[PDB]
């Protein structure tokens, strides 16, 4: 990595004192992970950040997030975890963000999208309409050989990662190290997360004259699984990613499906 | 007051509570008005009762028009924010609120909202718009004073 | 009670002011004498003209005599394809200034081109090409000069008379609301 | 429901300011709204009925009470609030009657009682006698200047001394001052701008 | 390709009717509102020059994407950072071609017609300017597509040897536009006494989306083009009209 990450992590270390109330709530998560171990021998790792001190610290970083979020969230991702280690050193894992938001000018209802609002933080609302099912998903695989001792490792991430894009690894089955070995896939020690795609359309009360509704489909991951029933009035915040190939890879009409990689799915009652 | 924009600004309501006890209400139940009762008063009335009273009659609690929600929504994007939905009038009221309170932290916010909507009534006054719906009723005077001046210059230059 | 606009000049009262400034003509009626007279109040000379010898009259008479073709409006010093090119290349290399305009900038480019279009050197794509080009360079710096307005002071060093009578009711109605906030908070 | 009639008279008046504003004249002033006036004037008779009611009782039962001085300080105010809504309305209706006597009355007519302001019903009895005296105040001014007799019209600057004037469908051969015109329908002229401005305003000769 | 920009760049700057010239006042008032288009009346092209319209009438698919870059070199003579490619919207009135007689001769020719719109579709995304990196070499590049002829006419290359098509599209730095996919039915007063009313499917670009409700009477000026998907014959294509400029009536 560059200095482009380098100064960028350092400025998110000045975000622990001006609004140090966020540094209080990290310990409260570390409280319930100890006192549950005191009864046996629940809380997620998601920190609600108001998008309100960022106007009062740096206007060139607050307007940075709402324009190109694939370059400022993964820096602020790793900056939070090292502060989530140095304060809490007793026990021996993403630590995601939320963005409460103080909702900006990207407050667009799902009828007005897709044109210049790619790669931004939209705040879409509406009525949920499909509610698909839950399946697990592989992230890390730890192999183990018992003829030479040591464990092993394999990262594996899909195109629906946290925010960015990298070289896609179609890792079916990592086996057969540089020896004569029959490697073993340790379950339990590996990691798995949940995955659920729901589709949301616009509200029929704020609709225009008689037409068909236009829906948009949002991916939820790592925390918000089984949060809303179908047929609820839901406000969602995410990043308007757009993945897939538009028929240019298969050497041969329509193309480029769009998704939202949601964070805060926040039920409303109005 | 001979101006009609000045008379209409007084009719707004403000959530202000009492301090004393009064045996009479021109508005109905229980003519002794008990103290620590909260009412909404017109600004022609709760503007002279906040001074004359050392304790005055009316406490004059702050409204939602200047709450922290509105004061945070106008620091993000002053262009595409509604001002015809709050009540209807903003600049004729937020001047009156400053004089009866003397706050130096509101006058550095309205003086930046006013510049950012100023720069986009000179662009849209060059002769298909939604900016007739989300303008402030104090700005719809200078929009019809500007757009009918560029029109009478572009008319004269070509026959 | 005028009651139409009542605080600005309407742009038919701007062609009334520019028509009081003198230019030169090449007359075609002598009336000098050899050895009945124009006796107006405000000019009262130049009864004595010679055929094709330059003299200097006020501008509102020299539009009366062009309609009958007894005169010919000469060009000023600025209606020149060699002179307006310096006043354009000044504007690109100095993004803060206004280059220079003889203060009848737009108005004398209208009353001359409609009425007197036989006396220049090729107005087709040589003078209406530059004058519209010099009005669109100039109307950028006015638009960038309004993000910087304050409540005490402003400088507008060299602007014409018609680029101001479209800009008064915007500025003096906004800067009267930036005055009543800074002094109401004190 | 205490000064609500102030907010119904004022918003009624804001309509007439925006029929004068953009492009059109305010020929046909709408109406004198009088039923909302009588409802306002009933309440200021009622609010006088209480301030004399407390005047006897403050000399017998209250005996100069400071809490009782608040009712003199509140019922004074609603007299002001309905005074201001009743002067903002009848000044706004005055200046349009000031402009209409200043553009198209006394202009090549020299005594125009009828034939102009064709309503004569939307004005009250008091606003119809204010106007008729005001037009005699104008003719005092045009008799002591002699810049021009009836200096009223033509605030357009003069240009192009000889104009073309086309008759739009109004016969009569009416004019006698500065010569007869022998006016026939649809026949255009070449006359100077001094003699037609007294007829171009009557809706009588269409072209400039 | 060469110098046909300058024969059009002088058309925008120098076209002028009697007193007030239009295409430097329609280009300036469509930037302050942030509208980013232009409307060329097609009679004013052939009055100014006939050699320009001779090229545009013969081969329109290769020259209208040359006029779109001749506008965006003029809008940098007025504004002085992000100015996209402008869009060209044109309209005219020669003679309507009825919807029934569209032969095999009108392939890639400017054609106007009329009808009633049945249905619309949901919006989509087409790519204009995308960024590619190789998986092994990691040699970055940038392909900018501007022409529109629906499936694939410009694709990824095969080498910067390396493998079959080693290229990846990166989704973090690109630009996208919209498409609309209408359908259009002929007017029932040109009655098919023994036939059913036919229909065609159009496309629309970025600034004509969401303009027309189903059930109106429109007049449509476009390029009658062809595309060869298999979504029933041998070497069979399918027809469709690439709309550039929908002149609807008053909507009423």
Coordinates of N, CA, C and O in Angstrom, one line a residue, chain A residues 16-145:
Chain A
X16 N -10.8 10.2 18.1 CA -11.1 9.4 19.3 C -11.1 10.3 20.5 O -11.2 9.8 21.6
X17 N -11.0 11.6 20.4 CA -10.9 12.5 21.5 C -11.9 13.6 21.5 O -12.5 14.0 22.5
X18 N -12.1 14.2 20.3 CA -13.1 15.2 20.1 C -14.5 14.7 20.4 O -15.4 15.4 20.9
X19 N -14.8 13.5 19.9 CA -16.1 12.8 20.2 C -15.8 11.5 20.9 O -16.3 10.4 20.4
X20 N -15.0 11.5 22.0 CA -14.5 10.3 22.7 C -15.6 9.5 23.3 O -15.4 8.4 23.8
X21 N -16.9 9.9 23.2 CA -18.0 9.1 23.6 C -18.2 7.8 22.8 O -18.7 6.9 23.3
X22 N -17.7 7.9 21.6 CA -17.6 6.6 20.8 C -16.6 5.7 21.4 O -16.8 4.4 21.3
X23 N -15.5 6.2 22.0 CA -14.5 5.3 22.6 C -15.0 4.7 23.9 O -14.5 3.7 24.4
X24 N -16.1 5.3 24.5 CA -16.7 4.7 25.6 C -17.5 3.5 25.3 O -17.5 2.5 26.0
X25 N -18.2 3.5 24.1 CA -19.1 2.4 23.8 C -18.4 1.2 23.3 O -19.0 0.1 23.2
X26 N -17.1 1.3 22.9 CA -16.3 0.1 22.5 C -16.1 -0.7 23.8 O -16.1 -2.0 23.7
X27 N -15.8 -0.1 24.9 CA -15.6 -0.8 26.2 C -16.9 -1.5 26.6 O -16.9 -2.6 27.2
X28 N -18.1 -0.9 26.3 CA -19.3 -1.5 26.8 C -19.6 -2.8 26.0 O -20.3 -3.7 26.5
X29 N -19.1 -2.9 24.8 CA -19.2 -4.1 24.0 C -18.2 -5.1 24.7 O -18.5 -6.3 24.8
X30 N -17.1 -4.7 25.1 CA -16.1 -5.5 25.8 C -16.6 -5.9 27.2 O -16.0 -6.8 27.8
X31 N -17.5 -5.2 27.7 CA -18.1 -5.5 29.0 C -19.0 -6.8 28.9 O -18.8 -7.7 29.6
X32 N -19.9 -6.8 27.9 CA -20.8 -7.9 27.8 C -20.2 -9.1 27.3 O -20.8 -10.2 27.3
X33 N -19.0 -9.0 26.7 CA -18.3 -10.2 26.2 C -17.4 -10.8 27.4 O -16.9 -11.9 27.2
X34 N -17.3 -10.1 28.5 CA -16.7 -10.7 29.7 C -17.7 -11.3 30.6 O -17.6 -12.4 31.1
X35 N -18.8 -10.6 30.9 CA -19.8 -11.0 31.9 C -20.7 -12.1 31.4 O -21.3 -12.8 32.2
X36 N -20.7 -12.3 30.1 CA -21.3 -13.5 29.5 C -20.4 -14.7 29.7 O -20.9 -15.9 29.9
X37 N -19.1 -14.5 29.7 CA -18.2 -15.6 30.0 C -18.1 -15.9 31.5 O -17.6 -17.0 31.8
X38 N -18.5 -15.0 32.3 CA -18.5 -15.3 33.8 C -19.7 -16.1 34.2 O -19.7 -16.6 35.3
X39 N -20.8 -16.2 33.4 CA -21.9 -17.0 33.7 C -21.8 -18.4 33.0 O -22.3 -19.4 33.6
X40 N -21.3 -18.4 31.8 CA -21.1 -19.7 31.1 C -19.9 -20.4 31.5 O -19.9 -21.7 31.6
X41 N -18.8 -19.7 31.8 CA -17.5 -20.4 32.2 C -17.1 -19.8 33.6 O -17.8 -18.9 34.2
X42 N -23.5 -12.1 21.9 CA -24.8 -11.4 21.7 C -24.6 -10.1 21.0 O -25.3 -9.8 20.1
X43 N -23.7 -9.3 21.5 CA -23.6 -7.9 20.9 C -22.8 -8.0 19.6 O -21.8 -8.7 19.6
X44 N -23.1 -7.2 18.6 CA -22.4 -7.2 17.4 C -21.2 -6.2 17.5 O -21.0 -5.6 18.6
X45 N -20.4 -6.1 16.5 CA -19.2 -5.3 16.4 C -19.5 -4.0 15.6 O -18.6 -3.6 14.8
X46 N -20.7 -3.4 15.7 CA -21.1 -2.3 14.9 C -21.3 -1.1 15.7 O -22.0 -1.0 16.6
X47 N -20.5 0.0 15.3 CA -20.4 1.2 16.0 C -21.2 2.3 15.3 O -20.9 2.6 14.1
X48 N -22.2 2.9 15.9 CA -23.0 3.9 15.3 C -22.2 5.2 15.4 O -22.0 5.7 16.4
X49 N -21.8 5.7 14.2 CA -21.0 6.9 14.1 C -22.0 8.0 13.5 O -22.6 7.8 12.5
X50 N -22.1 9.1 14.3 CA -22.9 10.2 13.7 C -22.0 10.9 12.7 O -20.8 11.0 12.8
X51 N -22.7 11.3 11.6 CA -22.0 12.0 10.6 C -22.1 13.5 10.8 O -22.6 14.3 10.0
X52 N -21.8 13.9 12.0 CA -22.0 15.2 12.5 C -20.8 15.9 13.1 O -20.7 17.1 13.1
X53 N -19.8 15.2 13.6 CA -18.6 15.8 14.0 C -17.7 16.0 12.8 O -16.8 16.9 12.8
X54 N -17.9 15.2 11.7 CA -17.1 15.3 10.6 C -17.2 16.7 9.8 O -16.2 17.1 9.2
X55 N -18.3 17.4 10.0 CA -18.4 18.8 9.6 C -17.5 19.7 10.5 O -17.1 20.7 10.0
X56 N -17.3 19.3 11.7 CA -16.6 20.2 12.6 C -15.1 19.7 12.9 O -14.5 20.3 13.7
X57 N -14.7 18.7 12.2 CA -13.2 18.4 12.2 C -12.6 18.7 10.8 O -11.6 19.4 10.8
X58 N -13.1 18.1 9.7 CA -12.5 18.3 8.4 C -13.6 18.2 7.4 O -14.2 17.1 7.1
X59 N -13.9 19.4 6.7 CA -14.8 19.4 5.6 C -14.3 18.7 4.4 O -15.0 18.4 3.4
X60 N -13.0 18.5 4.3 CA -12.4 17.8 3.2 C -12.4 16.3 3.4 O -11.9 15.5 2.5
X61 N -12.9 15.8 4.5 CA -13.0 14.4 4.7 C -14.5 14.0 4.8 O -14.8 12.9 4.4
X62 N -15.3 14.9 5.4 CA -16.7 14.6 5.4 C -17.3 14.6 4.0 O -18.1 13.7 3.7
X63 N -17.0 15.5 3.2 CA -17.4 15.4 1.8 C -16.6 14.4 1.0 O -17.0 14.2 -0.2
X64 N -15.6 13.9 1.5 CA -14.9 12.8 0.9 C -15.7 11.5 0.9 O -15.6 10.7 -0.1
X65 N -16.3 11.2 2.0 CA -17.0 9.9 2.2 C -18.2 9.9 1.3 O -18.5 8.9 0.5
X66 N -19.0 11.0 1.2 CA -20.2 11.0 0.4 C -20.0 11.1 -1.1 O -20.9 11.4 -1.8
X67 N -18.8 11.0 -1.6 CA -18.5 11.1 -3.0 C -17.8 9.9 -3.5 O -18.2 9.3 -4.6
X68 N -16.8 9.4 -2.8 CA -16.1 8.2 -3.2 C -15.9 7.3 -2.0 O -14.8 7.3 -1.4
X69 N -16.9 6.5 -1.6 CA -16.7 5.8 -0.3 C -15.9 4.5 -0.4 O -15.7 3.9 0.6
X70 N -15.5 4.1 -1.6 CA -14.6 2.9 -1.7 C -13.2 3.3 -1.4 O -12.3 2.4 -1.6
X71 N -12.8 4.5 -1.1 CA -11.5 4.9 -0.7 C -11.4 5.5 0.7 O -10.2 5.7 1.1
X72 N -12.4 5.7 1.4 CA -12.3 6.2 2.7 C -12.9 5.3 3.8 O -12.5 5.4 5.0
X73 N -13.8 4.4 3.5 CA -14.3 3.5 4.5 C -13.3 2.3 4.8 O -13.1 2.1 6.0
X74 N -12.7 1.7 3.8 CA -11.7 0.6 4.2 C -10.5 1.2 4.8 O -9.8 0.5 5.5
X75 N -10.1 2.5 4.6 CA -9.1 3.1 5.6 C -9.7 3.2 7.0 O -9.0 2.9 8.0
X76 N -10.9 3.7 7.1 CA -11.5 3.9 8.5 C -11.9 2.6 9.1 O -12.2 2.5 10.3
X77 N -11.9 1.5 8.3 CA -12.2 0.2 8.8 C -11.0 -0.3 9.7 O -11.2 -0.6 10.9
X78 N -9.8 -0.3 9.2 CA -8.7 -0.8 9.9 C -8.2 0.1 11.0 O -7.5 -0.3 11.9
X79 N -8.6 1.4 10.9 CA -8.2 2.3 11.9 C -9.0 2.1 13.2 O -8.5 2.4 14.3
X80 N -10.2 1.5 13.1 CA -11.0 1.3 14.2 C -10.6 0.1 15.0 O -10.7 0.0 16.2
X81 N -10.1 -1.0 14.3 CA -9.8 -2.2 15.0 C -8.5 -2.1 15.8 O -8.5 -2.8 16.9
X82 N -7.6 -1.3 15.4 CA -6.3 -1.2 16.2 C -6.6 -0.4 17.5 O -5.9 -0.5 18.5
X83 N -7.6 0.5 17.4 CA -8.0 1.2 18.6 C -9.0 0.2 19.4 O -9.1 0.4 20.6
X84 N -9.6 -0.7 18.7 CA -10.3 -1.7 19.4 C -9.5 -2.9 19.9 O -10.0 -4.0 20.3
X85 N -8.2 -2.7 19.8 CA -7.3 -3.7 20.5 C -6.5 -3.0 21.6 O -6.3 -3.7 22.7
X86 N -6.0 -1.8 21.5 CA -5.1 -1.2 22.4 C -5.8 -0.8 23.7 O -5.1 -0.6 24.7
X87 N -7.1 -0.6 23.7 CA -7.8 -0.3 24.9 C -8.2 -1.6 25.7 O -8.3 -1.6 26.9
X88 N -8.4 -2.7 25.0 CA -9.0 -3.9 25.5 C -8.0 -5.0 25.3 O -8.0 -5.6 24.2
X89 N -7.2 -5.4 26.3 CA -6.1 -6.3 26.1 C -6.3 -7.6 26.9 O -5.4 -8.5 26.9
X90 N -7.3 -7.7 27.7 CA -7.5 -8.9 28.5 C -8.0 -10.2 27.8 O -7.4 -11.2 28.2
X91 N -8.9 -10.3 26.8 CA -9.2 -11.6 26.4 C -8.3 -12.1 25.3 O -7.7 -11.4 24.5
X92 N -8.2 -13.4 25.2 CA -7.3 -14.1 24.2 C -7.9 -15.4 23.8 O -8.2 -16.3 24.6
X93 N -13.9 -10.9 12.3 CA -13.9 -9.9 13.4 C -13.7 -8.5 12.8 O -12.7 -7.9 13.0
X94 N -14.7 -8.0 12.1 CA -14.5 -6.8 11.3 C -14.5 -5.5 12.0 O -13.7 -4.6 11.6
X95 N -15.3 -5.3 13.0 CA -15.6 -4.0 13.6 C -16.1 -3.0 12.6 O -15.4 -2.0 12.3
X96 N -17.3 -3.3 12.1 CA -17.8 -2.5 11.0 C -18.3 -1.1 11.5 O -18.4 -0.9 12.7
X97 N -18.6 -0.3 10.5 CA -19.2 1.1 10.8 C -20.7 1.0 10.6 O -21.3 0.0 10.1
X98 N -21.4 2.1 11.0 CA -22.8 2.2 10.7 C -23.2 3.4 9.8 O -23.8 3.2 8.8
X99 N -22.7 4.6 10.2 CA -23.2 5.9 9.6 C -24.6 6.2 9.8 O -25.5 5.9 9.0
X100 N -24.9 6.5 11.1 CA -26.2 7.1 11.4 C -26.7 8.2 10.4 O -27.8 8.1 9.9
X101 N -25.8 9.2 10.2 CA -25.9 9.9 8.9 C -26.2 11.4 8.9 O -25.5 12.1 8.2
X102 N -27.3 11.8 9.6 CA -27.9 13.2 9.5 C -28.1 13.5 8.0 O -27.6 14.5 7.5
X103 N -29.0 12.7 7.5 CA -29.2 12.3 6.1 C -28.9 13.4 5.1 O -29.6 14.5 5.1
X104 N -28.0 13.3 4.1 CA -27.6 14.3 3.3 C -28.5 14.7 2.1 O -29.7 14.5 2.2
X105 N -28.0 15.2 1.0 CA -28.8 15.5 -0.1 C -29.0 14.2 -1.0 O -29.8 14.2 -1.9
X106 N -28.3 13.1 -0.6 CA -28.6 11.8 -1.2 C -29.7 11.1 -0.4 O -29.5 10.1 0.3
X107 N -30.9 11.7 -0.4 CA -32.0 11.1 0.3 C -33.1 10.6 -0.7 O -34.3 10.9 -0.5
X108 N -32.7 10.0 -1.7 CA -33.5 9.8 -2.9 C -34.4 8.5 -2.7 O -33.8 7.5 -2.4
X109 N -35.6 8.7 -2.9 CA -36.6 7.6 -3.1 C -36.3 6.8 -4.3 O -35.7 7.3 -5.3
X110 N -36.6 5.5 -4.3 CA -36.1 4.6 -5.4 C -36.7 4.7 -6.7 O -36.6 3.8 -7.6
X111 N -37.4 5.8 -7.0 CA -37.8 6.1 -8.4 C -36.8 6.9 -9.1 O -36.7 6.9 -10.3
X112 N -36.0 7.7 -8.4 CA -35.0 8.5 -9.0 C -33.5 8.0 -8.6 O -33.0 8.4 -7.6
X113 N -33.0 7.2 -9.5 CA -31.7 6.6 -9.2 C -30.9 6.4 -10.5 O -31.1 7.1 -11.5
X114 N -29.8 5.7 -10.4 CA -29.0 5.0 -11.4 C -28.3 5.9 -12.4 O -27.5 5.4 -13.2
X115 N -28.5 7.2 -12.3 CA -27.9 7.9 -13.4 C -26.5 8.5 -13.0 O -25.5 8.0 -13.5
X116 N -26.4 9.3 -12.0 CA -25.2 9.8 -11.5 C -24.9 9.4 -10.1 O -24.0 9.8 -9.5
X117 N -25.8 8.6 -9.5 CA -25.7 8.2 -8.1 C -25.1 6.8 -8.0 O -25.5 6.0 -7.2
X118 N -24.1 6.5 -8.8 CA -23.3 5.3 -8.6 C -22.1 5.7 -7.7 O -21.6 6.8 -7.9
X119 N -21.8 4.8 -6.8 CA -20.7 5.0 -5.8 C -20.9 6.2 -4.9 O -20.1 7.1 -4.9
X120 N -22.0 6.2 -4.2 CA -22.4 7.2 -3.2 C -23.0 6.6 -2.0 O -23.2 5.4 -2.0
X121 N -23.4 7.4 -1.1 CA -24.2 6.9 0.1 C -25.6 7.4 -0.1 O -26.0 8.4 0.5
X122 N -26.4 6.6 -0.7 CA -27.9 6.9 -0.9 C -28.6 6.5 0.4 O -28.0 5.7 1.2
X123 N -29.7 7.1 0.6 CA -30.6 6.7 1.8 C -32.0 6.4 1.2 O -32.8 7.3 1.2
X124 N -32.2 5.2 0.9 CA -33.4 4.8 0.1 C -34.5 4.4 1.2 O -34.1 3.9 2.3
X125 N -35.7 4.6 0.8 CA -36.8 4.1 1.7 C -37.9 3.4 0.8 O -37.8 3.3 -0.4
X126 N -38.8 2.8 1.5 CA -39.9 2.1 0.7 C -40.5 1.0 1.5 O -40.5 1.0 2.7
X127 N -41.0 0.0 0.7 CA -41.7 -1.1 1.3 C -41.1 -2.4 0.7 O -41.0 -2.6 -0.5
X128 N -40.6 -3.2 1.7 CA -39.8 -4.4 1.3 C -40.7 -5.4 0.6 O -41.8 -5.7 1.0
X129 N -40.3 -6.0 -0.5 CA -41.1 -7.0 -1.3 C -40.8 -8.4 -1.6 O -41.6 -9.0 -2.3
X130 N -39.7 -9.0 -1.2 CA -39.4 -10.4 -1.5 C -39.0 -11.2 -0.3 O -39.7 -12.2 0.1
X131 N -38.0 -10.8 0.4 CA -37.5 -11.5 1.6 C -37.0 -12.9 1.3 O -37.7 -13.9 1.6
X132 N -35.9 -13.0 0.6 CA -35.3 -14.3 0.3 C -34.7 -15.0 1.5 O -34.7 -14.4 2.6
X133 N -34.1 -16.1 1.3 CA -33.7 -17.0 2.4 C -32.3 -16.8 2.8 O -31.5 -16.1 2.0
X134 N -31.8 -17.4 3.9 CA -30.5 -17.2 4.4 C -29.6 -18.4 4.1 O -30.0 -19.5 4.2
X135 N -28.4 -18.1 3.6 CA -27.4 -19.1 3.4 C -26.1 -18.6 4.0 O -25.8 -17.4 3.9
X136 N -25.3 -19.5 4.5 CA -23.9 -19.1 4.9 C -23.0 -18.9 3.8 O -23.3 -19.1 2.6
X137 N -21.8 -18.4 4.1 CA -20.8 -18.0 3.1 C -19.4 -18.1 3.6 O -19.2 -17.6 4.7
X138 N -18.5 -18.7 2.9 CA -17.2 -18.9 3.3 C -16.4 -17.6 3.2 O -16.6 -16.8 2.3
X139 N -15.5 -17.4 4.2 CA -14.5 -16.3 4.1 C -13.1 -16.8 4.3 O -12.2 -16.6 3.4
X140 N -12.8 -17.4 5.4 CA -11.5 -17.9 5.7 C -11.5 -19.4 5.8 O -12.4 -20.0 6.3
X141 N -10.4 -20.0 5.4 CA -10.2 -21.5 5.5 C -8.9 -21.8 6.1 O -7.8 -21.4 5.5
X142 N -8.9 -22.5 7.2 CA -7.6 -22.9 7.9 C -7.4 -24.4 7.7 O -8.3 -25.2 8.1
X143 N -6.4 -24.8 7.0 CA -6.0 -26.2 6.8 C -5.0 -26.6 7.8 O -4.4 -25.8 8.5
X144 N -4.9 -27.9 7.9 CA -4.1 -28.5 9.0 C -3.5 -29.8 8.5 O -4.2 -30.7 8.0
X145 N -2.2 -30.0 8.6 CA -1.5 -31.2 8.3 C -0.9 -31.8 9.5 O -0.2 -31.1 10.3

